[PDB]
Design a protein around this ligand. Structure first.
Ligand SMILES: O=S(=O)(c1cccs1)N1CCOCC1
Lengths: 300, 237
């Protein structure tokens, strides 16, 4: 189990850690989060009490370094930093733990939610979508645009998701215009899987990361990417059986975790109705269709 | 974006543009089978691609052999239309290629956009106008070449005959749409109006009769009366 200490908490803020959150008062004696499960990526996220504008946060993996949070009064945000002095870090954590100034990552033993949401998400792949090579952790916020959003404006602050565009030469073979537009299997299997992602695990990792950024930061471009990657599979007549079964599991846990009151903004009616009721895969997503129909029957 | 009554003079500016109408591409007769089921029999169709400024009509005849062994023909017809329009554009010299293609039915937008990805600077647009181009097969010389075709064939026509020697393209398009709307509303009466007088003939190289300017005014009035007459018959007015 690993720890992310905080130097202090000078401004009132709601702090998230993965799917959990808690409120810290201004100048409250909060000094971090302990008992963070090793083996997964994590996200630690912030929404200031006095300005809910800009949710922001950091994706990290405690296996890659010792990380802590410290507020910067000039830039006005909680910043993640890496501590390279291993003995200093251990001594800091131990004192804060002895004084009981940390919250414990509140994982229920039966609960696989976080694993199920991050099964295919790897830090190395996050760091290629979010480009800032001098840090081992990656900053994301509510306002960051995607490479695709920018083509239709600062490049260094962009989410470099893989561009998916159904009416593009990449998606449509000359001479197979009708075939490739109505059945996206070529674009899914040859262009995206064999060509760009190399395997379905990397494709699912990016889909899962897009969902999590949409949910935790309200990042609109990430929501667009998440739906595009779902639509691309559902709109393909030829998908390996193992991918369809895994997609059903991925989406089931995403829909299960979504705040019920954020459905209006995080779910695209057209894509979901098309995917569940019209597409080639309308009958392949049994678990996802059941949870969607019981939890969000209005959207459908 | 969409082409409507606000931007109507745009049709007659100097930017090359084409209307594409697909309403006569896939044509069938519905009939009973020996067992009392229902089947369709295709008949030859056509793509109606028209430059409204010059009267240039590229009539691509769609021979029934195109449909042999194919499924979902009403869907295929849209993609075949787009394939043929794309092939026409590529066949034209660069300085003759359109800058815009206006489709008369919104279901043609995605098929044509996809076929024209190689031409990102040609705008593909819908229209809010209700144009009567389906009635093109009521023009006898057009129907004749479509029905006689034994293989795929492109036939070229100036749909305005020689009218542009005497009138503007705005007025020629208005005359064309009035004639086609009349033929669509009551084909028999419209043809009677156009051919009732044996002394006015259709030149070998023309589609419509050789009316003088004053005769065209009479004809145009008779077509408006027909359209209004049929409107009253339809709605009991
Ligand atoms: O010039 S045209 O009016 C023309 C129409 C379409 C493309 S070029 N013309 C060419 C000869 O055949 C008769 C019609």
């Amino acid at each position: 189990m690993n720890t992310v200490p905080f130097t202090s908490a000078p401004i009132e803020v709601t702090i998230g850690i993965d799917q959990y959150s808690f409120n810290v008062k201004e100048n409250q004696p909060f000094h971090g989060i302990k008992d963070i499960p090793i083996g997964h990526v994590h996200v630690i996220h912030f929404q200031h009490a006095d300005n809910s504008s800009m949710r922001y946060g950091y994706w990290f993996d405690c296996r890659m370094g010792n990380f802590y949070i410290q507020y910067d009064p000039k830039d006005g945000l909680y910043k993640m930093m890496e501590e390279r002095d291993g003995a200093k870090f251990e001594n800091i954590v131990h004192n804060f733990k002895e004084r009981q100034m940390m919250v414990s990552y509140p994982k229920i033993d039966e609960d696989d939610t976080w694993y199920n949401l991050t099964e295919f998400v790897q830090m190395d792949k996050i760091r290629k979508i979010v480009r800032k090579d001098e840090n081992q952790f990656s900053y994301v916020d509510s306002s960051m645009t995607t490479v695709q959003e920018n083509e239709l404006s600062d490049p260094a602050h962009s989410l470099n998701y893989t561009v998916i565009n159904f009416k593009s030469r990449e998606a449509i073979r000359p001479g197979h215009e009708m075939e490739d537009f109505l059945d996206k299997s070529y674009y899914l299997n040859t262009v995206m899987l064999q060509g760009i992602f190399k395997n379905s695990s990397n494709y699912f990792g990016e889909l899962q990361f897009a969902f999590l950024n949409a949910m935790f930061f309200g990042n609109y471009g990430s929501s667009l990417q998440w739906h595009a990657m779902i639509e691309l599979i559902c709109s393909s007549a030829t998908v390996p059986k193992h991918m369809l079964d895994k997609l059903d599991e991925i989406l089931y846990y995403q829909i299960k975790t979504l705040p019920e009151q954020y459905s209006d903004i995080l779910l695209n009616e057209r894509v979901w109705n098309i995917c569940l009721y019209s597409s080639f895969q309308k009958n392949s997503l049994h678990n996802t269709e059941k949870i969607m129909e019981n939890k969000y029957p209005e959207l459908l | 974006g969409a082409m409507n009554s606000s931007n109507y003079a745009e049709l007659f500016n100097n930017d090359i543009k084409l209307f594409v109408d697909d309403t006569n591409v896939y044509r069938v007769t519905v009939h009973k089978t020996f067992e009392g089921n229902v089947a369709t029999k295709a008949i030859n169709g056509c793509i109606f691609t028209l430059n409204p400024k010059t009267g240039h009509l590229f009539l691509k005849i769609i021979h029934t052999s195109v449909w042999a062994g194919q499924k979902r023909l009403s869907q295929l017809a849209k993609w075949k239309t787009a394939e043929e329009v794309s092939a026409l554009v590529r066949s034209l010299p660069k300085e003759e290629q359109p800058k815009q293609i206006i489709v008369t039915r919104k279901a043609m937008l995605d098929p044509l956009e996809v076929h024209m990805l190689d031409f990102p600077n040609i705008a593909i647009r819908p229209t809010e106008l209700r144009l009567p181009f389906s009635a093109a097969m009521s023009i006898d010389k057009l129907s004749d070449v479509v029905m006689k075709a034994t293989e795929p064939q492109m036939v070229l026509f100036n749909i305005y005959d020689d009218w542009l020697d005497r009138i503007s393209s705005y007025t020629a398009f208005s005359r064309l749409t009035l004639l086609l709307r009349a033929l669509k509303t009551n084909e028999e009466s419209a043809k009677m109006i156009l051919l009732s007088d044996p002394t006015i003939t259709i030149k070998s190289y023309h589609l419509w009769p050789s009316f003088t300017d004053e005769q065209w005014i009479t004809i145009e009035s008779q077509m408006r009366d027909l359209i209004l007459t049929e409107y009253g018959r339809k709605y009991n007015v």
